[PDB]
Amino acid sequence: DADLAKKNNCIACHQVETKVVGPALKDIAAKYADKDDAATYLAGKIKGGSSGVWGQIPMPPNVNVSDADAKALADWILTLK
Template sequence: MATSLLAAALASCMAQADGSTEDEAMIDLAWDSGCFNCHDLDKSLRGPAWRDVAERYRDDDEALERLVVTVRDGGSGNWGEERMTPNRRVAEEDIKRLVSWLLSLPPAEEES
């Protein structure tokens, strides 16, 4: 119950920030895929905050392909010692959509 309330609140805030239903759909997909077990939009949990990922790779034209592989196969060493577990149960197209979306996130201070 708390998770679904948090998801609804987060999706609502994201949709209100820019009026985008795509943000809401991506938040829902991330919850359904288990991403929020280790990640958050704005703060580090077991894994890095997604806005930090977006900031690090913002000007890297090859980041999408590399990050899709990391999400699918797992990895470590890019954000400390914590290992990212493989996510092979998530469809590759969904991983690509999520990674593409998170790479487009603006820094927190740019949101109103």
């Protein structure tokens, strides 16, 4: 899989097992979006950006993509296992 997050930017710094700027996807998803529907929870951090939640560089305010194309991603993020 992997295509929308790459077509936009999510993957630009979020791989599946490895990471470049921030944390990888297999983790960001298994880190907080691995319990309940955190997808709706952490949805506040994705756009809220991060500063000292991980340790990497501070990510800018990027939610997912645009209107719906953005949500279509949050789905593939909860199914990266």
